[PDB]
Amino acid sequence: GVGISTGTFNNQTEFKFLENGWVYITANSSRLVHLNMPESENYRRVVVNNLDKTAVNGNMALDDTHAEIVTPWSLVDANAWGVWFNPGDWQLIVNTMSELHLVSFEQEIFNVVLKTVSESATQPPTKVYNNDLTASLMVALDSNNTMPFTPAAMRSETLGFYPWKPTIPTPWRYYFQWDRTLIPSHTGTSGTPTNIYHGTDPDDVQFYTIENSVPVHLLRTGDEFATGTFFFDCKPCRLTHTWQTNRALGLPPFLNSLPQSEGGTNFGYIGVQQDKRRGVTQMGNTNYITEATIMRPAEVGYSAPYYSFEASTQGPFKTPIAAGRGGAQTDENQAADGDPRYAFGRQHGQKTTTTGETPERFTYIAHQDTGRYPEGDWIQNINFNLPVTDDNVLLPTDPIGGKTGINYTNIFNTYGPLTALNNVPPVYPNGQIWDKEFDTDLKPRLHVNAPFVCQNNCPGQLFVKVAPNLTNQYDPDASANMSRIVTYSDFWWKGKLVFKAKLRASHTWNPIQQMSINVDNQFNYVPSNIGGMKIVYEKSQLAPRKLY
Amino acid sequence: GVGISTGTFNNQTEFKFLENGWVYITANSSRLVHLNMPESENYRRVVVNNLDKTAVNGNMALDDTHAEIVTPWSLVDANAWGVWFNPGDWQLIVNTMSELHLVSFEQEIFNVVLKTVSESATQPPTKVYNNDLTASLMVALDSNNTMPFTPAAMRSETLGFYPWKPTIPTPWRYYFQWDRTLIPSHTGTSGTPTNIYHGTDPDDVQFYTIENSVPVHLLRTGDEFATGTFFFDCKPCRLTHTWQTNRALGLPPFLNSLPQSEGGTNFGYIGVQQDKRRGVTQMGNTNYITEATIMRPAEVGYSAPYYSFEASTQGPFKTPIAAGRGGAQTDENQAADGDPRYAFGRQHGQKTTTTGETPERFTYIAHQDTGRYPEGDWIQNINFNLPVTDDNVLLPTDPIGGKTGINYTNIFNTYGPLTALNNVPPVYPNGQIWDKEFDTDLKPRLHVNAPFVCQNNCPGQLFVKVAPNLTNQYDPDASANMSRIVTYSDFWWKGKLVFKAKLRASHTWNPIQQMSINVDNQFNYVPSNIGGMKIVYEKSQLAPRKLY
Amino acid sequence: GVGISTGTFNNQTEFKFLENGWVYITANSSRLVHLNMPESENYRRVVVNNLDKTAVNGNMALDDTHAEIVTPWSLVDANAWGVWFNPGDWQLIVNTMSELHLVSFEQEIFNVVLKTVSESATQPPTKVYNNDLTASLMVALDSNNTMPFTPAAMRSETLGFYPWKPTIPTPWRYYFQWDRTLIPSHTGTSGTPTNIYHGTDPDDVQFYTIENSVPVHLLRTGDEFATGTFFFDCKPCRLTHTWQTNRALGLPPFLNSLPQSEGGTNFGYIGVQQDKRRGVTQMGNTNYITEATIMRPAEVGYSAPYYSFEASTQGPFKTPIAAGRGGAQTDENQAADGDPRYAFGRQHGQKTTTTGETPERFTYIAHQDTGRYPEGDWIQNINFNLPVTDDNVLLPTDPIGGKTGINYTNIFNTYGPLTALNNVPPVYPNGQIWDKEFDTDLKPRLHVNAPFVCQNNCPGQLFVKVAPNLTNQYDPDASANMSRIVTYSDFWWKGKLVFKAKLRASHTWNPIQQMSINVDNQFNYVPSNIGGMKIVYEKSQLAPRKLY
């Protein structure tokens, strides 16, 4: 009731060691959640069209045009690593574990409190906060997944990552179908390229409402709500990275001459003339057997067009790629297409005492060597007469379509039946944990935003909303917006995310990479003298594994 | 208690598919209901007499004279289609179902909240809202149907049609017997026609009070009330329309000459001289057998006097008719007597963001072809000498009583033992669902306001009222009206209306009419950019069925 | 508790038809009851002495001198017909029933609410009402009848007669013994007649307190109280009236000459000389046998001194009489001694919208013909020489004691062993229902105020009082009256009064008197256009019955 708590705070992470090197990881997360009443009680169909930006020739990548339904509901999303693990737990997992299985998820709301605000007309303004013991919090669990799936991690709008910091839900909204055409252009393009919002296709209209699709629980201060346990059906997530490219697959050539002294220039030598060597190649018209030409079982990674923008009914979108760029591990400045860039605020890692709306950002450079170095690619004539002449080779420095800044690698695609690739690594703390699989007939082989993909279903989205607190003058048949008592709710959210992981084994003489605190990064993991906190991103696939 | 909810919000519509093509439709509807304390705590016997309007000769149709008992109670009425089905559900029903059975109805009130208003005498006015945890809401269910039946759909005063929009009950009142005489007149009528309110007949006086007839429950904030399930006993409602008139019944004539080429003017021909044909007619003194004169099994539809006003003890009233006008399906402007016209506000379909008290209106044009085209009627002498001469035929253009604007069709009635007709179609969203059968010895064959008629009884009306919240200065022996604390209540209403329907079958080569979203009507079914909503009317008897 | 109701409102009257023409009448009555805290918390012994009025010679009938204990308690009295039956129920009972048995009575208090008033010192006065959730209502049921019996109907201070109108209890007080002498006088009396309040006789002192005699329940807002069912032990009450006087008892004389034609003056004739007739008389010295002198079995009714005032220890009081005056049925203006006169306010029948403290009044004229017509009495000498001479007869026009306005009928008493009389009829709505029998050794044969007399005991009186709500400055050892928080209570009272009645039978060819609505009285039974209500008195012994 009014004076009785309905739940307990718990933010402990439990590691229970099972038999045969398996560990049962239970991540308990609890948060105080602050919820204001919605700006409006009505659903809105809102169109955004930043014509001012895209009207500048060459700015088509800046398109924000879309249509969305703005709802009075708020989304409680815990689908991000930082919600469940602090840096120490993450270190333990990524240093001691080799693979991760997502097992189950459950959440509850308890200790609901609803308050009203009265602001007097006194010349020196003043306001008072009073409990509304009979007011209700509306809670809806879309366990059947009737609503569109809108994971908040993509917008950095999940629950906060600090147990001792109150957090907020995010106002819920979803895309509403629209037709939009945007012809690309460049600086110096003559005229005005077609840039039009065409409207909505009636056959694609889907207006969803929570009230018509999901049972809604009314929670007074003495009530609680528990979702029950949901069990996942996902593939395991590897906590190791592969390093072998095509060049490091299989038996190396036999070295007939080995170095006799230590030193930088004391190389070995194969010792057999290149066109007199033994082995197998797929180049049926040459006798050269080299590390570049020797047959490999398949292809590790693939080349794809990079910063290619494809257009469909709704306008242009960047073509996604599975893996990051090669060479970024050596030079951070070379991080580009395929290296996810995260931008987030003070709830999710940015130093909490900073000021301004400029977000904290980082580009994740995965340890896996499955990318491409397009500056090193080339195409040459089938005749394969070496050394190749200018007319018989296409180089990455050769312009395509007359454009000095575009080469064939920009439009190149080597994905095929022989392609082998890995799933995206977890991105702590801002990365998404699980994602919903598409309801297309043919499904993608992976998702680029989360390591765990929901093959059949994963937990229903949790929606909350302050129930309307009407004054005595309400008139439903009037055009003016409803008159409401200013009401807001604080409730406690507790979730339990269960993983299963395998303890790693030492396979090599040498030690392996391990996440460690050091003098440089020390102060990223403790509060500042004024309580300021931050959570820096951490890599997750530290240890290597042999691909082949 | 104070901090514990007593019910759950549910506005889902469930379709459970039974065996053999039958579907169990459960319509769950939930609403937040706002109730102010009554203007007065006393019953009033009020007489209305718009003598100013009817005193103008020729305005007798504008009579509003009547007597009613105004009660302090409010009526919670959910008897309208829009309360239970959104447009998508209605589309599913009317496109996939052939008939509809009304099964059961139940409703409950929960999460009662009562608040008081205190408005200070401060020069800048201010008011505060406080919970009255010990105040009560008075709830009475007239399960025995002791009270007069006053369905709110007729006045467009049912609960609103939007789950996310708070709604209100309607102040309850009922007719009180009166005698009234109004002699009709026209412009140019000499003198003042008798226009008098005669009073009340003592033998017809019926003063009903809720307190003396119905048990009254007092609900505090921790209490709830459930009516229990009521099971209906009504006839099924068809979701198909008949198109066959008398002219399309039975075996057509045999065509002895069929067209040889496609084209507009390539007609067939019966090929037998009209007075030499074989068949049966009811015209015993003629040898002509034509499509107009051939015997048909019975009569589909009937002609009735239209815009005829009959007078009784209480004054004039329009004579109702079962079916709409013929030709309205081709031309909307020809919709007249028999085509119900609905007028409603922003709770019940009118664009919620509109301003002013002008209501939204529509005339329902049913798909069934059971009406009459009076311009096509005629009467001719029994001698039946063709071509008929002027003196031997009465045409719709012949004046009656010397009035150029009145013809015999205005006073014509062809209802008889051979008449066949259909029940009124459901009118979504504003149409009434069920209605109470009259307690006369001889009962009408149908009602024009609802498809489902209550043969024995249907659910008792639900009445609510804020219990009087007295100040300390109450004096019952004083003439002044009672001094009350300004109190109002918000409670949640939930109802469950159960139907049973039969899935339609395809009987013909061709497809049939189906309700569909399209480019024209698209934006009638989604919110506006400022949250404005509307519910446009939908037809219900789309698919055809053969009458004979 | 605070948010949970403890009872249900019910004002229904149930007629359950038993076997053999008996009906079980259950009168349910419910009221909202408003109770202010007592003016003082102490008992007071107060003496009233309107010496100014009685000091005028000839005004002794206006004596109001008495002594009473004024208590801080309030009395909840439902002992009046109007509390239990509306006019329709009363019509049903008095038209269809022949006798009435009082069976049982029970009552309860529920949904208690206590509030405090805070009135600010702001220059524009303002006051606020707040629930005192911990305050208590003190409720005492004197089931043992230890307290004096003070039926409120005598002062028109019972609960109100309208279910939808809040009512109040009456401040409780009871008589305290006193000695008082008032010598009667007339206009023109010389000197000052003795008019003295003598004080109190110590041997007759009885100071009663609720606290010392009755267990007291403390009800907080979440508590209720039920008296339990009390079963009465009273005689049945007839709903028929007798019409036969002594003149209509037994065998009429045989008419030897019957009229031969219809007409006003066609009388029958006994046809036997009066002193030659056969029969029996109690006049042993006369041969005249007439309708006036023939022996009758006994005497119906009796003559008593009228407007006689007897004096005892406490001063003069009117001598009560069992039956009303003869001839009042023909002329209302002749209603006098024995015809009870009721005066009441707007809670109990007076038009609720009237203004001023002038009460509504009516004189009840019973249908029974058991009274006397003193103008028709006479006394004559035993010699009985007819026609009687002046000296041998005492006429009602003969002065007694030399007073032209006083005759022997004013001091006449014919009550004796032969007297037969009826119980007083019920007086709807203001009449008392039951009354407590005196605790004298010899008990009266009836009471004039109620038809049902309590032979052993009838339900204990119900007392309520707002418990003292003290401020922080209370000092019990100070002479000043206690400082209390202004507190008041609203509670719901529900009672159930059970009767048993016998359905009437038709004994005669002719129909009988029946209460009916008509054009004249129509508007006495329905609310006015501003909600004004009234309850007019109704007669109860409509149907006749044969006495002998």
mmCIF file of all heavy atoms in Angstrom, chain B residues 188-214:
data_model
loop_
_atom_site.group_PDB
_atom_site.id
_atom_site.type_symbol
_atom_site.label_atom_id
_atom_site.label_comp_id
_atom_site.label_asym_id
_atom_site.label_seq_id
_atom_site.Cartn_x
_atom_site.Cartn_y
_atom_site.Cartn_z
ATOM 1 N N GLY B 188 -49.052 32.272 -45.178
ATOM 2 C CA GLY B 188 -50.304 32.779 -45.691
ATOM 3 C C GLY B 188 -51.533 32.274 -44.968
ATOM 4 O O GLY B 188 -52.641 32.734 -45.271
ATOM 5 N N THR B 189 -51.380 31.337 -44.034
ATOM 6 C CA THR B 189 -52.505 30.928 -43.205
ATOM 7 C C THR B 189 -53.001 32.115 -42.391
ATOM 8 O O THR B 189 -52.210 32.838 -41.779
ATOM 9 C CB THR B 189 -52.097 29.780 -42.278
ATOM 10 O OG1 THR B 189 -51.983 28.566 -43.032
ATOM 11 C CG2 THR B 189 -53.121 29.590 -41.164
ATOM 12 N N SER B 190 -54.316 32.314 -42.386
ATOM 13 C CA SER B 190 -54.906 33.435 -41.671
ATOM 14 C C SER B 190 -55.128 33.081 -40.205
ATOM 15 O O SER B 190 -55.490 31.953 -39.861
ATOM 16 C CB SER B 190 -56.234 33.840 -42.312
ATOM 17 O OG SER B 190 -57.157 32.766 -42.298
ATOM 18 N N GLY B 191 -54.905 34.066 -39.339
ATOM 19 C CA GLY B 191 -55.108 33.857 -37.922
ATOM 20 C C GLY B 191 -53.944 33.124 -37.274
ATOM 21 O O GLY B 191 -52.865 32.954 -37.851
ATOM 22 N N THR B 192 -54.184 32.687 -36.044
ATOM 23 C CA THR B 192 -53.184 31.977 -35.248
ATOM 24 C C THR B 192 -53.661 30.555 -34.982
ATOM 25 O O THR B 192 -54.592 30.360 -34.175
ATOM 26 C CB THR B 192 -52.929 32.705 -33.928
ATOM 27 O OG1 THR B 192 -54.176 32.955 -33.267
ATOM 28 C CG2 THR B 192 -52.216 34.026 -34.178
ATOM 29 N N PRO B 193 -53.079 29.538 -35.617
ATOM 30 C CA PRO B 193 -53.514 28.161 -35.345
ATOM 31 C C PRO B 193 -53.333 27.809 -33.877
ATOM 32 O O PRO B 193 -52.437 28.315 -33.199
ATOM 33 C CB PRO B 193 -52.603 27.311 -36.239
ATOM 34 C CG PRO B 193 -52.047 28.247 -37.250
ATOM 35 C CD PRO B 193 -52.007 29.596 -36.623
ATOM 36 N N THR B 194 -54.208 26.934 -33.384
ATOM 37 C CA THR B 194 -54.135 26.520 -31.988
ATOM 38 C C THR B 194 -52.771 25.909 -31.692
ATOM 39 O O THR B 194 -52.352 24.946 -32.339
ATOM 40 C CB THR B 194 -55.245 25.516 -31.673
ATOM 41 O OG1 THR B 194 -56.523 26.139 -31.855
ATOM 42 C CG2 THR B 194 -55.124 25.014 -30.239
ATOM 43 N N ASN B 195 -52.078 26.481 -30.706
ATOM 44 C CA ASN B 195 -50.730 26.055 -30.316
ATOM 45 C C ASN B 195 -50.661 26.183 -28.794
ATOM 46 O O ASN B 195 -50.323 27.245 -28.267
ATOM 47 C CB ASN B 195 -49.672 26.902 -31.014
ATOM 48 C CG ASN B 195 -48.258 26.481 -30.670
ATOM 49 O OD1 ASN B 195 -48.027 25.752 -29.709
ATOM 50 N ND2 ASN B 195 -47.299 26.948 -31.460
ATOM 51 N N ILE B 196 -50.974 25.095 -28.096
ATOM 52 C CA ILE B 196 -51.203 25.131 -26.656
ATOM 53 C C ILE B 196 -50.527 23.938 -25.999
ATOM 54 O O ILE B 196 -50.576 22.819 -26.522
ATOM 55 C CB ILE B 196 -52.707 25.137 -26.324
ATOM 56 C CG1 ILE B 196 -52.919 25.113 -24.809
ATOM 57 C CG2 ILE B 196 -53.402 23.953 -26.977
ATOM 58 C CD1 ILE B 196 -54.074 25.966 -24.344
ATOM 59 N N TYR B 197 -49.902 24.181 -24.849
ATOM 60 C CA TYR B 197 -49.443 23.127 -23.951
ATOM 61 C C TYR B 197 -50.528 22.923 -22.897
ATOM 62 O O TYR B 197 -50.804 23.827 -22.101
ATOM 63 C CB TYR B 197 -48.108 23.516 -23.319
ATOM 64 C CG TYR B 197 -47.596 22.545 -22.282
ATOM 65 C CD1 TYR B 197 -46.818 21.457 -22.649
ATOM 66 C CD2 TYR B 197 -47.881 22.726 -20.935
ATOM 67 C CE1 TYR B 197 -46.341 20.573 -21.703
ATOM 68 C CE2 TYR B 197 -47.410 21.844 -19.983
ATOM 69 C CZ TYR B 197 -46.642 20.769 -20.373
ATOM 70 O OH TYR B 197 -46.169 19.888 -19.429
ATOM 71 N N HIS B 198 -51.145 21.743 -22.891
ATOM 72 C CA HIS B 198 -52.351 21.515 -22.107
ATOM 73 C C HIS B 198 -52.082 21.102 -20.665
ATOM 74 O O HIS B 198 -53.008 21.141 -19.848
ATOM 75 C CB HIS B 198 -53.213 20.442 -22.779
ATOM 76 C CG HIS B 198 -54.018 20.951 -23.934
ATOM 77 N ND1 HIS B 198 -53.950 20.391 -25.192
ATOM 78 C CD2 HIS B 198 -54.909 21.966 -24.021
ATOM 79 C CE1 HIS B 198 -54.764 21.041 -26.004
ATOM 80 N NE2 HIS B 198 -55.358 22.001 -25.319
ATOM 81 N N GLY B 199 -50.861 20.717 -20.329
ATOM 82 C CA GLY B 199 -50.554 20.220 -19.005
ATOM 83 C C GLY B 199 -50.264 18.732 -19.003
ATOM 84 O O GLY B 199 -49.814 18.149 -19.991
ATOM 85 N N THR B 200 -50.535 18.110 -17.858
ATOM 86 C CA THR B 200 -50.235 16.702 -17.638
ATOM 87 C C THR B 200 -51.503 15.939 -17.279
ATOM 88 O O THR B 200 -52.340 16.427 -16.514
ATOM 89 C CB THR B 200 -49.193 16.528 -16.526
ATOM 90 O OG1 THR B 200 -47.945 17.094 -16.946
ATOM 91 C CG2 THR B 200 -48.995 15.054 -16.202
ATOM 92 N N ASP B 201 -51.633 14.742 -17.837
ATOM 93 C CA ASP B 201 -52.743 13.859 -17.501
ATOM 94 C C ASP B 201 -52.408 13.104 -16.218
ATOM 95 O O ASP B 201 -51.429 12.350 -16.198
ATOM 96 C CB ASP B 201 -53.003 12.882 -18.642
ATOM 97 C CG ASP B 201 -54.192 11.973 -18.385
ATOM 98 O OD1 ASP B 201 -54.820 12.080 -17.312
ATOM 99 O OD2 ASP B 201 -54.495 11.141 -19.264
ATOM 100 N N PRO B 202 -53.177 13.270 -15.138
ATOM 101 C CA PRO B 202 -52.787 12.627 -13.871
ATOM 102 C C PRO B 202 -52.650 11.119 -13.972
ATOM 103 O O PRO B 202 -51.791 10.539 -13.299
ATOM 104 C CB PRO B 202 -53.915 13.028 -12.907
ATOM 105 C CG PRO B 202 -55.048 13.461 -13.775
ATOM 106 C CD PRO B 202 -54.425 14.041 -15.000
ATOM 107 N N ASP B 203 -53.465 10.465 -14.799
ATOM 108 C CA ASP B 203 -53.402 9.015 -14.919
ATOM 109 C C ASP B 203 -52.135 8.532 -15.611
ATOM 110 O O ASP B 203 -51.846 7.332 -15.567
ATOM 111 C CB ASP B 203 -54.631 8.510 -15.673
ATOM 112 C CG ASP B 203 -55.927 8.971 -15.036
ATOM 113 O OD1 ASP B 203 -56.054 8.857 -13.799
ATOM 114 O OD2 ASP B 203 -56.816 9.452 -15.769
ATOM 115 N N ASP B 204 -51.377 9.425 -16.244
ATOM 116 C CA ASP B 204 -50.155 9.055 -16.942
ATOM 117 C C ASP B 204 -48.897 9.509 -16.215
ATOM 118 O O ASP B 204 -47.802 9.411 -16.780
ATOM 119 C CB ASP B 204 -50.168 9.639 -18.356
ATOM 120 C CG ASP B 204 -51.413 9.263 -19.127
ATOM 121 O OD1 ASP B 204 -51.921 8.141 -18.926
ATOM 122 O OD2 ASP B 204 -51.886 10.097 -19.924
ATOM 123 N N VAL B 205 -49.022 10.002 -14.984
ATOM 124 C CA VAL B 205 -47.875 10.548 -14.271
ATOM 125 C C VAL B 205 -46.997 9.412 -13.768
ATOM 126 O O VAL B 205 -47.474 8.477 -13.114
ATOM 127 C CB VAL B 205 -48.339 11.443 -13.113
ATOM 128 C CG1 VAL B 205 -47.163 11.814 -12.218
ATOM 129 C CG2 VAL B 205 -49.030 12.689 -13.651
ATOM 130 N N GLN B 206 -45.699 9.496 -14.061
ATOM 131 C CA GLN B 206 -44.719 8.530 -13.569
ATOM 132 C C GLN B 206 -43.461 9.297 -13.171
ATOM 133 O O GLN B 206 -42.650 9.658 -14.027
ATOM 134 C CB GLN B 206 -44.417 7.469 -14.620
ATOM 135 C CG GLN B 206 -45.591 6.552 -14.915
ATOM 136 C CD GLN B 206 -45.180 5.327 -15.704
ATOM 137 O OE1 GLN B 206 -44.594 5.436 -16.778
ATOM 138 N NE2 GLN B 206 -45.475 4.151 -15.166
ATOM 139 N N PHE B 207 -43.312 9.552 -11.874
ATOM 140 C CA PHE B 207 -42.119 10.198 -11.334
ATOM 141 C C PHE B 207 -41.193 9.110 -10.802
ATOM 142 O O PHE B 207 -41.473 8.500 -9.765
ATOM 143 C CB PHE B 207 -42.494 11.195 -10.241
ATOM 144 C CG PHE B 207 -41.315 11.773 -9.504
ATOM 145 C CD1 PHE B 207 -40.125 12.043 -10.163
ATOM 146 C CD2 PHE B 207 -41.402 12.049 -8.151
ATOM 147 C CE1 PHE B 207 -39.046 12.573 -9.481
ATOM 148 C CE2 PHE B 207 -40.327 12.579 -7.466
ATOM 149 C CZ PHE B 207 -39.147 12.840 -8.131
ATOM 150 N N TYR B 208 -40.104 8.857 -11.520
ATOM 151 C CA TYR B 208 -39.114 7.862 -11.132
ATOM 152 C C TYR B 208 -37.951 8.526 -10.409
ATOM 153 O O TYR B 208 -37.513 9.617 -10.782
ATOM 154 C CB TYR B 208 -38.573 7.105 -12.348
ATOM 155 C CG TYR B 208 -39.604 6.329 -13.129
ATOM 156 C CD1 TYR B 208 -40.120 6.827 -14.316
ATOM 157 C CD2 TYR B 208 -40.042 5.087 -12.693
ATOM 158 C CE1 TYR B 208 -41.053 6.118 -15.040
ATOM 159 C CE2 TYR B 208 -40.977 4.369 -13.410
ATOM 160 C CZ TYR B 208 -41.478 4.890 -14.583
ATOM 161 O OH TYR B 208 -42.410 4.181 -15.305
ATOM 162 N N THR B 209 -37.450 7.855 -9.377
ATOM 163 C CA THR B 209 -36.226 8.254 -8.703
ATOM 164 C C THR B 209 -35.303 7.048 -8.602
ATOM 165 O O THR B 209 -35.750 5.921 -8.370
ATOM 166 C CB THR B 209 -36.499 8.822 -7.302
ATOM 167 O OG1 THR B 209 -36.928 7.771 -6.428
ATOM 168 C CG2 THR B 209 -37.570 9.905 -7.361
ATOM 169 N N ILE B 210 -34.007 7.294 -8.794
ATOM 170 C CA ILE B 210 -33.030 6.214 -8.690
ATOM 171 C C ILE B 210 -33.026 5.649 -7.277
ATOM 172 O O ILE B 210 -33.030 4.430 -7.073
ATOM 173 C CB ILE B 210 -31.632 6.714 -9.099
ATOM 174 C CG1 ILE B 210 -31.636 7.177 -10.560
ATOM 175 C CG2 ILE B 210 -30.588 5.626 -8.871
ATOM 176 C CD1 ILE B 210 -31.920 6.078 -11.560
ATOM 177 N N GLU B 211 -33.030 6.533 -6.280
ATOM 178 C CA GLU B 211 -32.874 6.102 -4.896
ATOM 179 C C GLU B 211 -33.976 5.138 -4.471
ATOM 180 O O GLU B 211 -33.718 4.208 -3.700
ATOM 181 C CB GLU B 211 -32.852 7.323 -3.977
ATOM 182 C CG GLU B 211 -31.615 8.199 -4.140
ATOM 183 C CD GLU B 211 -31.707 9.145 -5.327
ATOM 184 O OE1 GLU B 211 -32.701 9.067 -6.080
ATOM 185 O OE2 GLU B 211 -30.785 9.968 -5.508
ATOM 186 N N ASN B 212 -35.202 5.337 -4.958
ATOM 187 C CA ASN B 212 -36.327 4.505 -4.544
ATOM 188 C C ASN B 212 -36.453 3.216 -5.344
ATOM 189 O O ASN B 212 -37.244 2.348 -4.961
ATOM 190 C CB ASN B 212 -37.636 5.289 -4.666
ATOM 191 C CG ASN B 212 -37.759 6.383 -3.630
ATOM 192 O OD1 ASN B 212 -37.502 7.552 -3.912
ATOM 193 N ND2 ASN B 212 -38.158 6.010 -2.420
ATOM 194 N N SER B 213 -35.704 3.066 -6.436
ATOM 195 C CA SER B 213 -35.896 1.951 -7.356
ATOM 196 C C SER B 213 -34.671 1.070 -7.535
ATOM 197 O O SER B 213 -34.823 -0.094 -7.907
ATOM 198 C CB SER B 213 -36.322 2.476 -8.733
ATOM 199 O OG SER B 213 -37.698 2.812 -8.745
ATOM 200 N N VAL B 214 -33.471 1.583 -7.286
ATOM 201 C CA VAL B 214 -32.249 0.842 -7.587
ATOM 202 C C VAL B 214 -31.328 0.851 -6.372
ATOM 203 O O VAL B 214 -31.118 1.913 -5.769
ATOM 204 C CB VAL B 214 -31.533 1.433 -8.813
ATOM 205 C CG1 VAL B 214 -30.425 0.503 -9.287
ATOM 206 C CG2 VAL B 214 -32.528 1.704 -9.934
#
